[PDB]
Amino acid sequence: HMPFEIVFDGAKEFADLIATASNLIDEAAFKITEEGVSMRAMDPSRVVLIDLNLPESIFSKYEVEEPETIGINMDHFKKILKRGKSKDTLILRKGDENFLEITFEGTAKRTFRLPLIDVEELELELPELPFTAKVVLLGEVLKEAIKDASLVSDSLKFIAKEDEFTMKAEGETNEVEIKLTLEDEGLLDLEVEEETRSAYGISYLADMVKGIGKADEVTLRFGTEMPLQMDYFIRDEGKLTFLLAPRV
Amino acid sequence: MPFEIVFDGAKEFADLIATASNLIDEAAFKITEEGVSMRAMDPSRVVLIDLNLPESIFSKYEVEEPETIGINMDHFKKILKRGKSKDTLILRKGDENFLEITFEGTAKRTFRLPLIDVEELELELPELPFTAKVVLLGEVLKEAIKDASLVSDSLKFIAKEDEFTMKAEGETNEVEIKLTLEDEGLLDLEVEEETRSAYGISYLADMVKGIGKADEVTLRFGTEMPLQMDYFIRDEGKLTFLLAPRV
Amino acid sequence: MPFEIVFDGAKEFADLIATASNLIDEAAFKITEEGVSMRAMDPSRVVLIDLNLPESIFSKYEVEEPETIGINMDHFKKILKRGKSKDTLILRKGDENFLEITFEGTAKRTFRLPLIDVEELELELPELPFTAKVVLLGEVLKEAIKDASLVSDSLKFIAKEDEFTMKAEGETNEVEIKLTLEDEGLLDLEVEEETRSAYGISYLADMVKGIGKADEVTLRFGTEMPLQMDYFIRDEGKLTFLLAPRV
């Protein structure tokens, strides 16, 4: 565990990224190499897989001597990261000691000391899955549909056809459909190999999109009775990815 | 029995229904060729509400045959709360027995709302001998009710020739809200005789919860008489509360 | 008739009373012709609090009868939270035992807040040998108190000739806020010798709750001495907390 210094401009954007990921997980092992920071984790129900990739190109300073792996209490990390202001600089620094030093530089110099726990890593791989449908769309639409489907049901059907993406949720007698064509604003891109249907639990969906903003582009990939893969991009270089198991 | 009604400004429409459903729970909407109307009482039969929306405030108004539909107001409120200020609202009914609510904006979002049948009542609004008419900004009204709640649970209205007063007194505390024509918040006053009545704050509070700050509100009342309070939606639709006085 | 005081900007006045009520329950106001003054302790007898409002901050200040009134701060605060930022606040004491509070804006609103008899103790705001003085933005100050609240119950303050340093430590975790004259949030630093003290966060939490981020706070303290926190009210008035230290 050699020392490193990592620096990020915009402490608030970082917090909101960490907060999204932390919605599902509680402890995570961050891999720090000379190429970037990568975190890969499942939530306790072993239904969501989170994968964070922050290449070194999104950091204003990235001094990493030797590749190591630190364990972080995600909720404690978030309580601290939430004190960052939008124009603050975030500095994550480790010395010889077994804690993390999180510093905010702006109107003052605020320094926290975050104790480094140990996390047991699972053999977690991001496999190449045969997704038959791909969908880029505004977070605004996505956040909307999960909130609207929550009014009716616990699960949300996704239905992708050559020219229309559709979410649908059926309750005791109440029903909601959201429908999107390339003629719509919310829909940026739609690639369907074959007509594709699948369903996913709103509870998990609500937590994955909770930290996404109305303005962001989200990519969806999914297949008939296959995982849902949702990802968006951080400073157009970092990537946050969720893999979500279906309802069967 | 199909129809199609289109309203530009989904969020405005919600604010309207949300004002109505503060006191109502279930309503029959009368859909005719001239507009949509609804007349409901609250559970304690203290308040009559009367919503009229002429065809001229809808962008598209296609009604084949006049009809009446009953709506669970609370469910309808929940769905209407999902519209954005720039969405277009579409109220469509096919030959089936539910209500298609649709928001066209960044996406097409469609809800099916089951209809219900509603105990309708000998609901008529006779003209009553009001001796006082006040017109005032909504924020003056919302203020004086929120202020009065701190002291009492009744609000006394008192009109003389050139002063309008709301007064609320408790055991030791007391608040008074005086309005004269010189004040920006009063837009009009007409009093034929000195008028005094009192009304409950619980009901009043709920009547104005959904009223904008800069809305023009009209109050008509009379000594130991009901309080008629109305204000306009888009200058052509009208919302009326009739409120029973206190002893 | 015994006095009439007028203050343009009711919400500004409210926010000031609201600051000094986070610690105080009852208080005696000394109304002289020079201005209004107020000096109270919190129930712990740990924070001394002292408010002074020179008559030059009031648009109208007529005092016939210099006297002293007693006020239930929570009741006063409930009323004062009803003034709008464009309201004119009026305080009238007539012959009787109540304080008439008026908001003049879009309407005339009047409250009668009943006065009370407060066991006014003898409170001297003494002079103390402070060795460190710091001026800084509320934003910094409120953050440090929130930050430090995630770790500990006390907050060390540490002034050296060049840097000001708040520091809170628990069993495992640590926060540390450091300010030099090169930082935008420090505006004045005057240190006579190296100074260190400690204070309860819970009390610091309430003293700053009502302070705006744009505000300018003056800290004076010395080793194991009270903490003196000033912030000014329209440049003429002064609010002053005095905070017994933690050992």
XYZ file of C-alpha atoms in Angstrom:
742
model
C 0.000 0.000 0.000
C 2.234 2.806 -1.324
C 1.238 6.496 -1.211
C -0.742 8.268 -3.892
C -2.256 11.655 -4.634
C -5.350 12.090 -6.799
C -6.995 15.418 -7.568
C -10.414 16.232 -9.043
C -11.848 19.623 -9.944
C -15.501 19.861 -8.926
C -15.934 18.112 -5.625
C -19.735 18.084 -5.986
C -19.803 16.216 -9.306
C -17.639 13.552 -7.670
C -19.912 13.220 -4.627
C -22.977 12.806 -6.821
C -21.193 10.113 -8.780
C -20.175 8.316 -5.573
C -23.688 8.794 -4.135
C -25.317 7.097 -7.157
C -23.034 4.070 -6.845
C -23.423 4.013 -3.056
C -27.204 3.689 -3.402
C -26.793 -0.046 -3.818
C -23.515 -0.918 -2.199
C -22.121 -0.361 1.290
C -18.512 -1.520 1.029
C -16.411 -1.413 -2.103
C -12.837 -2.171 -3.085
C -11.322 0.568 -5.281
C -8.524 -0.584 -7.580
C -6.003 2.223 -8.117
C -3.603 1.637 -10.966
C -1.634 4.046 -13.078
C -4.396 4.023 -15.699
C -7.272 5.072 -13.446
C -9.570 4.090 -10.587
C -11.916 1.164 -11.009
C -14.510 -0.229 -8.646
C -16.579 -3.353 -9.137
C -19.203 -4.543 -6.706
C -22.567 -6.188 -6.162
C -25.323 -5.129 -3.828
C -26.274 -7.402 -0.913
C -29.128 -9.098 -2.787
C -26.601 -10.066 -5.524
C -29.033 -8.724 -8.162
C -27.334 -5.486 -9.198
C -23.764 -5.268 -10.402
C -22.146 -1.837 -10.259
C -18.996 -1.059 -12.236
C -17.225 2.284 -12.016
C -14.347 3.287 -14.274
C -12.589 6.654 -13.869
C -9.582 6.796 -16.196
C -6.739 9.051 -15.222
C -7.665 11.608 -17.901
C -10.471 13.015 -15.732
C -8.096 14.010 -12.896
C -6.187 17.274 -12.723
C -3.371 15.434 -10.947
C -2.877 11.712 -10.731
C 0.321 10.620 -8.983
C 0.144 6.856 -8.381
C 3.367 5.001 -7.625
C 2.332 1.342 -7.405
C -1.023 -0.325 -8.151
C -2.906 -1.075 -4.938
C -6.445 -1.692 -3.669
C -8.166 0.129 -0.824
C -11.355 -0.702 1.045
C -13.827 2.051 1.746
C -17.001 2.305 3.803
C -19.309 3.680 1.085
C -21.776 5.391 3.452
C -19.016 6.948 5.544
C -17.295 8.002 2.316
C -20.555 9.597 1.198
C -21.241 11.492 4.440
C -17.845 13.111 3.894
C -18.029 13.641 0.119
C -21.414 15.378 0.547
C -19.695 18.343 2.275
C -18.018 19.268 -1.043
C -19.069 22.465 -2.814
C -19.459 22.732 -6.580
C -16.326 24.859 -7.110
C -14.215 22.938 -4.566
C -11.248 20.805 -5.526
C -11.261 17.284 -4.163
C -7.965 15.676 -3.126
C -7.785 12.007 -2.154
C -4.391 11.281 -0.631
C -2.854 8.286 1.118
C 0.434 8.315 2.992
C 2.148 5.473 4.787
C -0.732 5.127 7.306
C -3.806 2.931 6.683
C -6.359 5.730 6.332
C -7.524 7.947 3.491
C -7.127 11.730 3.522
C -9.988 13.526 1.753
C -9.360 17.232 1.289
C -11.543 20.006 -0.081
C -9.703 23.131 -1.299
C -11.682 26.280 -2.012
C -12.674 29.035 0.413
C -10.909 27.042 3.199
C -8.781 23.881 3.352
C -11.004 21.171 4.892
C -9.403 17.810 5.611
C -11.067 14.594 6.696
C -9.379 11.369 7.689
C -11.377 8.357 6.420
C -10.380 4.999 7.976
C -9.620 2.243 5.459
C -11.451 -1.012 6.139
C -10.770 -4.336 4.376
C -13.262 -5.788 1.870
C -13.322 -9.385 0.713
C -13.465 -9.372 -3.077
C -15.675 -11.702 -5.042
C -14.645 -13.079 -8.415
C -16.665 -10.477 -10.335
C -16.362 -10.381 -14.135
C -18.161 -8.130 -16.598
C -19.112 -10.759 -19.228
C -19.918 -9.975 -22.859
C -23.648 -10.528 -23.057
C -25.655 -10.933 -26.271
C -27.851 -7.848 -25.978
C -30.340 -7.570 -28.819
C -31.529 -4.020 -28.061
C -29.738 -0.722 -27.409
C -31.337 2.558 -26.328
C -29.818 5.951 -25.562
C -32.200 8.403 -23.948
C -32.445 11.365 -21.592
C -32.249 10.662 -17.889
C -35.326 12.902 -17.596
C -37.470 10.363 -19.495
C -35.949 7.469 -17.539
C -36.472 9.062 -14.134
C -40.041 9.923 -15.184
C -41.002 6.389 -16.204
C -39.763 4.722 -13.048
C -41.710 7.245 -10.948
C -44.817 6.795 -13.109
C -44.583 2.987 -13.057
C -44.163 3.044 -9.271
C -47.759 4.334 -9.129
C -49.170 1.150 -10.627
C -46.883 -1.804 -10.065
C -43.617 -3.243 -8.749
C -42.170 -4.259 -12.132
C -41.642 -2.479 -15.436
C -41.766 -4.145 -18.870
C -39.328 -2.871 -21.498
C -40.397 -3.505 -25.103
C -38.130 -2.610 -28.009
C -39.254 -2.773 -31.615
C -37.761 -1.530 -34.843
C -39.188 1.983 -34.398
C -40.441 2.365 -30.805
C -39.084 1.903 -27.312
C -41.793 1.212 -24.747
C -42.091 0.818 -20.988
C -45.315 -0.545 -19.597
C -46.544 -1.287 -16.071
C -49.778 -3.127 -15.209
C -51.494 -3.102 -11.789
C -54.759 -4.404 -10.283
C -56.790 -2.329 -12.757
C -54.515 0.679 -13.430
C -52.042 0.794 -16.334
C -49.196 3.022 -17.531
C -47.332 3.034 -20.869
C -44.448 5.330 -21.806
C -43.678 5.246 -25.531
C -40.722 6.725 -27.400
C -39.935 7.037 -31.113
C -36.945 8.532 -32.888
C -39.278 11.490 -33.575
C -39.276 12.170 -29.804
C -36.882 14.467 -27.968
C -36.108 12.141 -25.058
C -34.916 9.408 -27.468
C -31.437 9.946 -28.986
C -30.781 6.499 -30.548
C -32.539 3.112 -30.922
C -30.912 -0.073 -32.288
C -33.001 -3.255 -32.202
C -31.869 -6.557 -33.711
C -35.161 -8.305 -32.885
C -38.321 -7.319 -31.033
C -37.275 -7.568 -27.388
C -39.288 -7.791 -24.163
C -38.100 -7.983 -20.551
C -39.170 -6.805 -17.134
C -37.335 -5.442 -14.118
C -38.206 -4.527 -10.554
C -38.967 -0.832 -10.044
C -37.362 -0.810 -6.595
C -33.870 -1.378 -8.021
C -34.544 0.822 -11.072
C -35.500 3.682 -8.744
C -32.136 3.496 -6.978
C -29.987 3.294 -10.112
C -31.518 6.419 -11.617
C -31.836 8.347 -8.318
C -28.473 10.077 -8.835
C -28.853 10.587 -12.586
C -29.838 14.095 -13.622
C -32.596 15.260 -15.960
C -29.938 16.369 -18.481
C -27.782 13.208 -18.817
C -27.663 10.672 -21.660
C -28.209 7.091 -20.481
C -27.502 3.931 -22.489
C -29.682 0.842 -22.005
C -28.950 -2.629 -23.329
C -31.173 -5.603 -22.751
C -32.559 -8.809 -24.141
C -35.490 -11.108 -23.733
C -35.108 -12.554 -20.208
C -31.676 -11.008 -19.923
C -29.960 -8.527 -17.633
C -30.585 -4.839 -18.114
C -27.386 -2.864 -18.659
C -27.578 0.850 -17.990
C -24.620 3.165 -18.162
C -23.765 6.831 -18.363
C -20.532 8.726 -18.799
C -18.540 10.954 -16.411
C -16.747 13.886 -18.075
C -17.208 11.852 -21.268
C -14.287 9.577 -20.117
C -15.386 7.994 -16.858
C -18.094 5.356 -17.025
C -20.593 4.138 -14.417
C -22.330 0.838 -15.275
C -25.170 -1.126 -13.651
C -26.060 -4.681 -14.645
C -29.539 -5.609 -13.441
C -31.115 -9.041 -13.234
C -34.609 -9.564 -14.680
C -37.922 -10.633 -13.176
C -38.727 -14.289 -13.943
C -69.655 7.548 -25.906
C -66.176 8.781 -27.006
C -64.707 12.247 -26.491
C -61.306 13.908 -26.689
C -60.205 16.972 -24.704
C -56.775 18.595 -25.076
C -55.422 21.156 -22.600
C -52.176 23.035 -23.140
C -50.277 23.241 -19.857
C -50.657 19.916 -18.047
C -49.285 21.353 -14.791
C -51.779 24.236 -14.693
C -54.572 21.705 -15.057
C -53.236 19.668 -12.106
C -53.065 22.747 -9.843
C -56.725 23.277 -10.726
C -57.871 19.746 -9.889
C -55.572 19.756 -6.854
C -57.395 22.788 -5.481
C -60.737 21.025 -5.973
C -59.683 17.722 -4.437
C -58.552 19.321 -1.164
C -62.161 19.108 0.007
C -63.726 16.677 -2.476
C -63.027 12.959 -2.726
C -65.353 11.751 -5.516
C -66.967 13.847 -8.237
C -69.194 13.580 -11.280
C -67.858 15.665 -14.182
C -70.579 16.730 -16.629
C -69.002 16.792 -20.106
C -71.219 18.649 -22.622
C -70.564 20.432 -25.894
C -70.000 23.762 -24.123
C -67.506 22.635 -21.502
C -66.761 20.489 -18.476
C -68.578 21.089 -15.212
C -68.493 19.448 -11.836
C -70.481 20.087 -8.660
C -69.461 18.363 -5.446
C -69.854 18.595 -1.710
C -67.279 17.654 0.847
C -67.899 14.813 3.361
C -69.201 17.108 6.146
C -71.617 18.847 3.720
C -70.232 22.221 4.886
C -68.664 23.114 1.529
C -70.052 23.129 -1.950
C -67.561 23.358 -4.799
C -68.461 24.248 -8.412
C -65.941 23.949 -11.241
C -66.853 25.121 -14.726
C -64.414 24.895 -17.655
C -65.815 26.182 -20.959
C -64.755 24.669 -24.217
C -62.823 27.857 -24.951
C -59.989 26.973 -22.538
C -59.247 23.605 -24.189
C -57.187 23.510 -27.380
C -59.177 20.580 -28.737
C -62.678 19.780 -27.550
C -64.347 16.859 -29.361
C -67.518 15.624 -27.623
C -69.892 13.288 -29.464
C -72.749 13.046 -26.955
C -73.007 14.831 -23.572
C -72.278 12.452 -20.695
C -71.225 12.201 -17.038
C -68.291 10.318 -15.509
C -67.403 9.722 -11.875
C -63.778 10.037 -10.864
C -61.839 9.124 -7.749
C -60.344 12.585 -7.127
C -57.394 11.334 -5.060
C -56.273 8.856 -7.729
C -56.850 11.511 -10.426
C -54.706 13.924 -8.414
C -51.820 11.417 -8.180
C -51.789 10.913 -11.970
C -52.223 14.619 -12.748
C -49.264 15.404 -10.455
C -46.990 13.688 -13.002
C -47.419 16.329 -15.735
C -44.797 18.969 -16.448
C -45.470 22.649 -17.045
C -44.745 22.238 -20.779
C -46.589 18.924 -21.364
C -49.889 18.743 -23.240
C -52.744 17.038 -21.392
C -55.132 14.749 -23.239
C -58.289 13.371 -21.647
C -59.640 10.716 -23.972
C -62.434 8.206 -23.443
C -62.921 5.315 -25.832
C -65.995 3.132 -25.916
C -64.536 1.092 -22.984
C -65.036 2.118 -19.307
C -61.945 3.966 -18.137
C -60.308 7.313 -18.745
C -57.198 7.646 -20.908
C -54.951 10.366 -19.502
C -51.993 11.252 -21.683
C -49.035 13.585 -21.456
C -47.323 14.543 -24.698
C -43.922 16.132 -24.179
C -40.403 14.693 -24.222
C -42.237 11.356 -24.238
C -45.805 10.135 -24.635
C -46.927 8.979 -21.178
C -50.347 7.334 -20.925
C -52.401 6.315 -17.906
C -55.614 4.336 -17.642
C -57.771 5.622 -14.790
C -60.774 3.417 -13.914
C -64.074 5.292 -13.666
C -66.570 4.889 -10.798
C -70.204 5.809 -10.198
C -71.055 8.625 -7.791
C -73.990 9.442 -5.517
C -75.267 12.645 -7.120
C -77.272 15.055 -5.020
C -79.900 17.799 -5.212
C -76.965 20.166 -5.713
C -78.235 23.620 -6.610
C -76.541 26.983 -5.916
C -79.369 29.531 -5.305
C -78.560 33.256 -5.426
C -78.364 34.381 -1.836
C -78.765 37.981 -0.606
C -75.081 38.930 -0.350
C -74.504 42.400 1.081
C -70.718 42.544 0.647
C -68.336 41.959 -2.242
C -64.562 41.964 -1.887
C -61.964 41.286 -4.554
C -58.425 40.773 -3.357
C -55.085 39.217 -4.181
C -54.818 35.594 -3.186
C -51.721 36.159 -1.086
C -53.643 38.585 1.167
C -56.157 35.783 1.667
C -53.669 32.932 2.199
C -51.814 35.232 4.640
C -54.761 36.133 6.854
C -55.856 32.498 7.129
C -52.367 31.234 7.957
C -52.046 34.147 10.384
C -55.455 33.516 11.989
C -54.706 29.808 12.439
C -52.065 30.848 15.026
C -54.787 32.262 17.306
C -58.264 30.795 16.878
C -60.122 28.221 14.810
C -62.752 30.707 13.537
C -62.224 33.760 11.339
C -64.592 36.726 11.534
C -65.062 38.761 8.343
C -66.335 42.328 8.873
C -67.145 44.739 6.034
C -67.993 48.422 6.422
C -68.155 51.043 3.694
C -64.388 51.554 3.175
C -62.703 48.871 5.335
C -62.580 45.078 4.999
C -61.453 43.246 8.137
C -60.631 39.704 9.090
C -60.334 39.217 12.818
C -59.400 36.164 14.829
C -59.267 36.156 18.648
C -58.194 33.456 21.073
C -57.919 33.350 24.850
C -55.227 36.057 25.080
C -53.834 36.410 21.535
C -55.535 38.280 18.712
C -54.873 39.068 15.040
C -56.629 41.572 12.737
C -56.096 42.055 8.996
C -57.462 45.439 7.843
C -57.826 46.269 4.152
C -58.750 49.612 2.603
C -58.910 50.749 -1.005
C -55.505 52.429 -0.431
C -53.832 49.002 -0.015
C -52.315 47.191 -3.012
C -53.904 43.884 -1.947
C -57.492 45.121 -2.280
C -58.678 45.314 -5.879
C -62.362 46.181 -5.195
C -64.931 46.546 -2.427
C -68.715 47.051 -2.571
C -70.764 47.093 0.622
C -74.452 47.895 0.784
C -74.681 47.523 4.585
C -72.252 46.688 7.391
C -71.761 42.929 7.191
C -70.434 40.466 9.768
C -69.956 36.723 9.555
C -67.526 34.120 10.837
C -66.170 30.984 9.194
C -64.011 28.061 10.146
C -60.297 28.133 9.531
C -59.945 24.396 8.814
C -62.206 24.687 5.768
C -60.911 28.127 4.676
C -57.319 26.888 4.940
C -58.069 24.022 2.589
C -59.953 26.237 0.135
C -56.986 28.535 -0.478
C -54.167 25.974 -0.176
C -54.198 25.665 -3.977
C -54.557 29.355 -4.854
C -51.681 31.230 -6.452
C -50.137 34.213 -4.725
C -51.184 36.769 -7.364
C -54.624 35.361 -8.198
C -57.611 37.700 -8.006
C -60.130 36.214 -5.581
C -63.740 37.300 -5.154
C -65.518 36.936 -1.836
C -69.264 37.449 -1.500
C -70.780 37.132 1.932
C -73.483 38.389 4.276
C -74.334 38.524 7.960
C -74.641 34.932 9.186
C -74.669 33.719 5.560
C -72.543 31.403 3.412
C -69.271 32.634 1.990
C -68.989 32.492 -1.749
C -65.394 32.559 -2.897
C -64.509 32.253 -6.559
C -61.575 32.863 -8.859
C -60.945 32.367 -12.561
C -58.906 29.784 -14.440
C -57.508 31.292 -17.634
C -60.029 34.182 -17.379
C -62.844 31.908 -18.727
C -63.070 28.916 -16.422
C -64.429 29.440 -12.951
C -63.980 27.774 -9.564
C -66.542 28.491 -6.833
C -66.574 27.595 -3.152
C -69.692 28.047 -1.055
C -68.928 27.804 2.657
C -71.356 27.513 5.561
C -70.931 30.103 8.329
C -70.241 29.521 12.000
C -72.602 30.116 14.950
C -48.066 55.621 22.992
C -45.274 54.626 25.476
C -43.242 53.843 22.372
C -43.452 53.337 18.634
C -40.600 51.715 16.709
C -40.568 51.067 12.962
C -38.168 48.867 11.003
C -38.214 48.552 7.182
C -37.809 44.909 6.237
C -39.745 42.574 8.478
C -38.091 39.365 7.243
C -34.663 40.811 8.086
C -35.797 41.594 11.646
C -37.363 38.117 11.943
C -34.136 36.389 10.913
C -32.285 38.245 13.671
C -34.778 37.430 16.446
C -34.740 33.912 15.046
C -30.950 33.753 15.452
C -31.011 34.811 19.108
C -33.893 32.435 19.972
C -32.009 29.224 19.139
C -30.465 29.579 22.600
C -32.939 31.789 24.445
C -36.469 31.164 25.750
C -37.438 34.396 27.511
C -35.797 37.793 27.334
C -36.074 41.328 28.660
C -35.737 44.129 26.104
C -34.480 47.456 27.417
C -36.058 50.181 25.270
C -34.269 53.493 25.793
C -34.108 56.473 23.500
C -30.643 55.357 22.371
C -31.923 52.099 20.951
C -33.053 48.639 21.974
C -30.819 46.285 23.929
C -31.215 42.740 25.142
C -28.996 40.554 27.270
C -29.853 36.950 28.194
C -28.366 33.597 29.054
C -29.368 30.247 27.734
C -30.762 27.669 30.207
C -27.290 26.084 30.613
C -25.828 29.432 31.763
C -23.123 28.547 29.256
C -23.817 30.996 26.424
C -24.214 34.644 27.164
C -26.059 36.491 24.413
C -26.249 40.263 23.951
C -28.165 42.176 21.251
C -27.945 45.919 20.659
C -29.991 47.850 18.109
C -29.152 51.554 17.877
C -32.099 53.779 17.052
C -30.356 54.663 13.744
C -31.349 51.310 12.207
C -35.058 52.152 12.670
C -36.960 54.304 10.206
C -39.116 55.622 13.081
C -38.118 55.571 16.745
C -40.393 57.416 19.179
C -39.892 56.514 22.831
C -42.033 58.544 25.258
C -41.579 56.099 28.201
C -38.188 54.337 28.530
C -38.898 50.951 30.083
C -38.260 47.193 29.876
C -40.523 44.489 28.464
C -40.506 40.707 28.755
C -41.094 38.447 25.781
C -41.707 34.756 25.111
C -39.098 34.363 22.347
C -40.853 31.357 20.779
C -44.148 33.202 20.577
C -42.421 36.323 19.233
C -40.637 34.128 16.706
C -43.886 32.462 15.606
C -45.360 35.899 14.896
C -42.254 37.390 13.275
C -41.997 34.492 10.787
C -45.113 35.980 9.164
C -43.477 39.167 7.895
C -42.512 39.382 4.238
C -39.176 40.842 3.143
C -40.944 43.922 1.782
C -43.024 44.371 4.957
C -42.628 47.218 7.391
C -42.536 46.022 10.981
C -44.150 48.157 13.669
C -43.847 47.617 17.393
C -46.332 49.582 19.490
C -46.647 49.428 23.235
C -49.835 51.150 24.392
C -51.206 51.557 27.900
C -52.057 47.844 28.360
C -49.845 44.770 28.990
C -49.446 43.620 25.395
C -47.084 44.389 22.548
C -48.753 45.325 19.271
C -46.834 44.008 16.251
C -47.744 45.252 12.812
C -46.762 44.257 9.294
C -47.567 46.980 6.769
C -47.360 45.753 3.201
C -50.022 44.519 0.808
C -52.319 44.761 3.844
C -52.162 45.917 7.451
C -51.711 42.903 9.735
C -51.692 43.255 13.499
C -50.841 40.858 16.305
C -51.226 41.379 20.027
C -48.436 39.413 21.662
C -48.977 39.282 25.450
C -46.001 40.443 27.546
C -44.596 38.419 30.474
C -42.588 39.047 33.653
C -39.022 37.693 33.218
C -36.741 37.038 36.191
C -34.037 39.335 34.855
C -30.724 38.391 36.461
C -27.733 40.743 36.577
C -25.683 40.144 33.424
C -22.435 42.006 32.741
C -20.845 41.650 29.311
C -17.294 41.975 30.688
C -14.005 42.720 28.999
C -11.745 39.699 28.574
C -8.016 39.404 27.677
C -8.371 37.914 24.207
C -5.157 37.007 22.393
C -6.629 36.066 19.034
C -9.046 37.752 16.696
C -10.394 36.282 13.491
C -12.811 37.705 10.948
C -14.268 35.302 8.417
C -17.295 34.454 6.299
C -20.258 32.642 7.809
C -20.045 30.053 5.007
C -16.638 28.880 6.308
C -17.858 28.986 9.898
C -21.104 27.095 9.323
C -19.272 24.476 7.270
C -16.587 23.858 9.887
C -19.315 23.348 12.509
C -21.213 20.898 10.294
C -17.980 19.111 9.241
C -16.780 18.845 12.843
C -20.187 17.552 13.905
C -19.573 14.354 11.878
C -16.647 13.394 14.161
C -16.858 14.829 17.657
C -18.754 16.857 20.251
C -16.046 19.527 20.711
C -14.052 21.750 18.396
C -10.510 22.903 19.066
C -9.698 26.422 17.851
C -6.037 27.189 17.177
C -4.626 30.547 16.078
C -0.945 30.986 15.259
C 0.577 34.159 13.865
C -0.105 33.037 10.269
C -2.951 30.462 10.286
C -6.311 29.770 11.960
C -7.168 26.144 12.653
C -10.318 24.405 13.863
C -9.855 20.717 14.614
C -12.194 18.002 15.846
C -11.009 14.478 16.631
C -12.866 11.307 17.632
C -11.644 7.791 18.336
C -10.920 6.999 14.678
C -11.972 9.925 12.468
C -10.643 13.484 12.226
C -11.693 16.770 10.624
C -9.335 19.737 10.289
C -10.177 23.166 8.864
C -7.192 25.434 8.127
C -7.309 29.076 7.016
C -4.495 31.381 5.944
C -4.667 34.982 4.778
C -4.294 33.612 1.228
C -7.758 32.011 1.543
C -10.931 33.779 0.393
C -12.807 32.921 3.603
C -10.422 34.578 6.047
C -10.628 38.394 6.025
C -8.704 39.481 9.146
C -6.298 37.618 11.427
C -4.691 39.215 14.484
C -2.834 36.873 16.880
C -0.937 38.172 19.940
C 0.353 34.727 21.003
C -0.316 31.135 19.952
C -3.827 30.397 21.184
C -5.777 27.177 21.671
C -9.215 26.504 23.169
C -12.137 24.104 22.756
C -15.880 24.476 22.521
C -19.007 22.356 22.399
C -20.293 21.814 18.871
C -23.923 21.643 20.005
C -23.735 25.263 21.185
C -21.727 26.405 18.182
C -24.322 24.619 16.043
C -27.119 26.832 17.325
C -25.176 30.111 17.300
C -24.501 29.888 13.573
C -27.752 28.231 12.438
C -29.248 31.687 11.751
C -26.165 33.272 10.160
C -26.019 33.692 6.399
C -23.117 32.357 4.339
C -22.385 35.844 3.016
C -22.219 37.205 6.588
C -18.995 38.383 8.241
C -18.331 36.966 11.709
C -15.761 38.210 14.258
C -14.217 35.621 16.569
C -12.260 36.576 19.652
C -10.827 34.039 22.035
C -7.846 33.149 24.178
C -6.419 29.991 25.658
C -9.087 28.351 27.858
C -11.204 31.500 27.678
C -14.740 32.074 26.395
C -15.374 32.492 22.705
C -16.719 35.860 21.571
C -18.590 35.824 18.263
C -19.872 39.107 16.801
C -21.843 39.714 13.686
C -23.222 43.072 12.651
C -26.783 44.033 11.761
C -26.951 46.691 9.059
C -23.513 47.852 10.205
C -24.930 49.740 13.231
C -26.490 46.952 15.307
C -24.453 44.163 16.878
C -25.276 40.596 17.909
C -22.801 39.021 20.358
C -22.575 35.484 21.657
C -20.186 34.589 24.466
C -19.366 30.911 24.814
C -17.913 29.277 27.899
C -15.126 26.825 26.968
C -15.025 23.033 27.177
C -12.861 21.212 29.751
